[PDB]
């Protein structure tokens, strides 16, 4: 178990999996709908 010191590069994920991401971190993670593909980007900030 390690704490991320600086924000990780965004990765593509499904809406169901990305909303889940938010349920753990939520101050520490960031998720957005990609308008064209309807999927979500998952970006882990510092402190994750």
């Amino acid at each position: 178990s390690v704490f991320l010191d600086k924000d990780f590069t965004f990765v593509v994920s499904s809406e169901a999996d990305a909303r889940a991401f938010v349920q753990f971190d939520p101050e520490h993670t960031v998720a957005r709908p990609l308008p064209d593909s309807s999927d979500w980007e998952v970006t882990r900030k510092a402190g994750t």
């Binding site: 965004f10 960031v30 957005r32 970006t43």
Partner: protein
């Protein structure tokens, strides 16, 4: 088919130059959160 293959690589480089420089000026990318649309969607729902 297209000889342009190295012109695709030449796009990637300045993107890195762009991205790295953008972080120095603290210009924030990927700032879109849940603020406006769903509230409007809630209003449009009512």
């Amino acid at each position: 088919s297209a000889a342009l293959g190295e012109f695709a690589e030449k796009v990637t480089g300045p993107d890195g130059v762009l991205a790295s420089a953008a972080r120095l000026v603290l210009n924030q990318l990927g700032l879109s959160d849940v603020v406006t649309t769903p509230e409007a969607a809630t209003d449009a729902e009512l």
